[PDB]
Structure formats: structure tokens, C-alpha cells
Design a protein around this ligand. Structure first.
Ligand SMILES: CN(C)[C@@H](Cc1c[nH]cn1)C(=O)O
Ligand SMILES: [Cl-]
Ligand SMILES: [Fe+3]
Ligand code: NA
Length: 441
């Protein structure tokens, strides 16, 4: 599996020494540099490959600016590097390309700002006492935030690069896709015994987390059936061949309108040619990996559920937590090595290939491989409180227009690989995300 490109595991707040944080910081930055350096021509930075997101030049400077602004806010920095850039590269969620649709700086100028910002932050780390443990009311929380924010944008930007033509990107040395064993095994429904789970994260938990992660909610989860694997490309191919995209009964009025307006006939990263479907990995087009989890948005996942019928649905946040972590929990960061997470592979993996990736529930790849959609409107947990460093992180998206996803993907790094991270997206948006199907009986 992908070894030459290595991502350092997250660190508990009680072990965030200066040395370890220096290493984690350097790894966070170098990884984004590798991805950004995969764009061959600088003119390509002014393309917005995703019609719902900004140009790539924005994301070149966004992670660096975020560091500086948060450090300034906690007064670990007395001044920034470029106030204009710190404004331009700050504001990052439209429902249409029209809504989404400024004079951007040159590519060299943004790289220069990145380089200056890196050295500035490194000096802050080398000249600040790391009095253990770090915590939410500690100024260094701003640094923890920036490093996790940079790693999140490694993922979001990977999606942008995937939407660029293959001829405009260059695969980094060591990038390695998972294998394909061909046709997938049978996807059996597994009974997940009912139980009670506690959602949320305590304020004194020794791990960095975003505001929406914190709170406390007990939820009694009734037993339910779930597919042992995420729905595979092969399984979704059947849905297509049975006219899944052409039968309104499987969709709803909102989802059908999306599909028609975007003239969708297949998942975003499939392409039909010569009687066969090709599939777009990060940097190359390859024969469709039939045993990999299918990558779809929420509308498409629900259309598949509609074709399956019989009340087929998606899990709730509580249902996923029960299946993944049970009713018990002390996080063991080393367990991230047991799942397709943290760049073990540079791609999705065949369901069940990572033999260490079966949860005690019997379900495979609940953690890792690809994010999995949930029928759960993004919402606060009892006890939620915005953090002064980033009050608009999650609160504006408690609007019943965002569905959640959990577990992490092959590209996911940092604290986002662990139990408490809560993810969300508009249901039409594409990520490294798939789904599994659920029935109550
Ligand atoms: C979690 N996710 C929906 C955010 C993560 C993020 C990026 N920058 C700030 N928050 C986004 O992609 O907008
Ligand atoms: Cl764990
Ligand atoms: Fe951001
Ligand atoms: Na998953």
C-alpha cells in the first residue's frame, strides 16, 4: 500500500510537545505542497474545476491564511504577512453554480506568501512554551485548528484536482492506487443489535476537535439491518443497467431536477466509451474497479435505495456510531492503521481488502475507504458552543439543507480520522463518499 507518501498520525493534547508538533506541522504542510505541486501549468490555478467552489488559486493560499488569522486572534502573532491576502483567502457553500459565479493574485505571489507563512509559524512554534496539556482555552488551540484545517483542505482540494483533465495534473512520486480483485463478493445484510449510544465529546477530552463535535446526547438505537460492505461500483452498475437514472419512481422531484439539469447518466467519475465504463482516479482514468465502493452524492444514494425498495434507507448518525463503536470509549490513534485512512492507499480500496477494517458489528469499512452518507440533517448536540476563534464554523449550516457523513476516507488525515469528527455536505455535492444500505426488517 501507499508508503512513499506518509501522513503522520494525530497526537493527544497531553503529548503535544514542541518537537512532535513541529513534525506534525511540517507533515501537514508538505502533504498539501505535494498535492498543489501536481498542477502542471499555473494558468490552471484560475480554473474552478468544481462549479460550486472557488478557483484553485484560492485554495493554494487559503490554508496558509487560516493559520495566520487564527494565530493573530490569540495574539501569538503581532502582525500578519499580507493583510489583503489574509482577507481574500479567508471566506470559503452555494446551492447553484450561478450563485457561486475578484482580481486574483499571481501563482508565484501566492506560493511566496505560503513560504513566508510557513517560516513565520515555525518560529512561533519554536519560540512558544508547549505547557502540557494543550486545551481549548489555551492559545495554541489556534495552531491545532490550523493544522487540522490544512489537512481537511488536502481532502477538499483533492476533489478539485480529480475534476481537472488528466493532462493538467501530474501524479506525485509514490502515489499508489489500491488494487482491484474484479467482481465483488456478495453484499449480505447484517443485523446490528440495538443499544444505547452516547454522541458527542467532552470539553476535557484530550484531542483537538471542532465545535460541532462537542456535546452529550444519549440515543436508544433499535436493532437494524445493514449491508456488510459499502455499495460497490458493480452493484451500482446494475442499478444503471436497470434504468435507475431514468425511472422517476426511484427519485424525488428535487433529486430528479438536479439529475436532469446536470444531464447525469452515471456517477460523476465514470465515463462510458467503447461499450465500457472508465473510472477517474486522482490522476489517471482506469477500468472501472468493480469491487471498490461507488462514489455518489446523497441524491444518487437515495435513488439506489428507491430501486432496492422495501423501505431501504440510510443510517442515522446514532446508527453509524452504534455499528462502528458500540455501546461502550478510549480512542487508540494507532487503530487508524487498521483502516483505509491516512493515505494507506491513494484511492478507494476493494471492500473487505483491508482485513483489519471489520468493525465488531461485522460491518466492513465503517471507518475509512470512503466517507459514507447518512440520513441525518447536520444539527447541534446538547451542549454545543461556538469557539471564539471560528464562530461561523458549523452554526450557519444547521439549516436542514446539509446531510452528514462519517467514518473518513482514504485521503482523510488528522483528528478527522477519529471518533468525534462530524462531517456534512449539501446533498448534491460530491466528495470521496459512498454509502451502505439499511433496512429495519
Ligand atoms: C466540514 N466541511 C463541510 C467544511 C470543512 C471546512 C473547510 N474550511 C472550513 N471548514 C467545508 O468543506 O467547508
Ligand atoms: Cl479508536
Ligand atoms: Fe477553509
Ligand atoms: Na466508511
Amino acid at each position: 500500500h501507499m508508503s512513499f507518501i506518509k501522513s503522520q498520525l494525530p497526537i493527544f493534547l497531553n503529548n503535544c510537545t514542541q518537537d512532535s508538533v513541529i513534525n506534525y506541522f511540517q507533515n501537514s504542510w508538505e502533504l498539501e505542497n505535494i498535492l498543489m505541486r501536481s498542477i502542471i501549468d499555473d494558468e490552471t490555478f484560475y480554473i474552478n474545476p468544481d462549479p460550486l467552489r472557488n478557483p484553485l488559486i484560492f485554495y493554494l493560499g487559503h490554508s496558509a491564511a487560516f493559520y495566520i488569522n487564527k494565530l493573530i486572534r490569540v495574539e501569538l502573532l503581532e502582525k500578519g504577512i499580507n493583510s489583503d491576502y489574509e482577507i481574500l483567502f479567508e471566506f470559503g457553500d452555494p446551492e447553484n453554480a450561478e450563485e457561486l459565479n475578484i482580481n486574483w493574485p499571481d501563482v508565484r505571489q501566492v506560493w511566496d506568501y505560503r513560504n513566508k507563512a510557513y517560516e513565520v509559524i515555525l518560529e512561533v512554534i519554536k519560540n512558544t512554551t508547549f505547557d502540557l496539556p494543550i486545551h481549548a482555552s489555551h492559545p495554541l488551540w489556534a495552531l491545532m485548528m490550523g493544522m487540522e484545517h490544512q489537512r481537511i483542505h488536502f481532502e477538499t482540494s483533492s476533489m478539485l484536482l480529480r475534476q481537472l483533465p488528466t493532462e493538467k495534473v501530474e501524479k506525485p512520486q509514490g502515489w499508489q492506487y489500491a488494487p482491484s480483485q474484479g467482481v465483488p463478493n456478495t453484499n449480505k445484510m447484517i443485523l446490528v443489535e440495538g443499544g444505547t449510544v452516547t454522541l458527542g465529546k467532552a470539553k476535557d477530552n484530550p484531542l483537538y476537535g471542532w465545535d460541532c463535535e462537542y456535546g452529550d446526547r444519549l440515543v436508544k438505537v433499535d436493532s437494524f439491518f445493514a449491508s456488510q460492505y459499502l455499495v460497490t461500483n458493480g452493484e451500482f452498475l446494475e442499478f444503471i443497467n436497470r434504468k435507475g437514472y431514468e425511472t422517476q419512481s426511484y427519485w424525488n422531484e428535487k433529486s430528479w431536477q438536479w439529475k436532469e439539469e446536470n444531464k447525469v447518466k452515471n456517477p460523476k467519475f465514470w465515463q462510458f466509451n467503447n461499450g465500457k465504463y472508465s473510472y477517474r482516479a486522482m490522476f489517471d482514468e482506469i477500468p472501472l474497479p468493480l469491487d471498490w465502493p461507488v462514489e455518489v452524492n446523497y441524491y444518487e444514494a437515495m435513488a439506489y435505495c428507491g430501486w432496492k425498495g422495501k423501505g431501504t434507507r440510510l443510517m442515522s448518525e446514532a446508527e453509524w456510531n452504534l455499528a462502528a463503536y458500540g455501546s461502550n470509549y478510549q480512542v487508540d490513534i494507532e487503530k487508524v492503521n487498521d483502516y483505509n485512512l491516512n493515505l494507506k492507499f491513494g484511492s478507494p480500496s476493494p471492500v473487505g481488502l483491508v482485513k483489519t477494517a471489520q468493525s465488531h458489528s461485522g460491518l466492513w469499512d465503517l471507518r475509512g475507504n470512503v466517507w459514507e452518507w447518512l440520513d441525518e440533517n447536520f444539527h447541534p448536540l446538547p451542549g454545543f458552543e461556538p469557539h471564539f476563534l471560528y464562530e461561523d464554523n458549523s452554526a450557519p449550516f444547521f439549516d436542514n439543507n446539509h446531510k452528514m457523513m462519517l467514518g473518513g476516507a482514504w485521503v482523510t488525515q488528522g483528528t478527522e480520522t477519529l471518533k468525534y469528527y462530524r462531517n456534512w455536505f449539501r446533498p448534491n455535492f460530491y466528495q470521496h463518499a459512498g454509502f451502505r444500505i439499511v433496512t429495519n426488517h
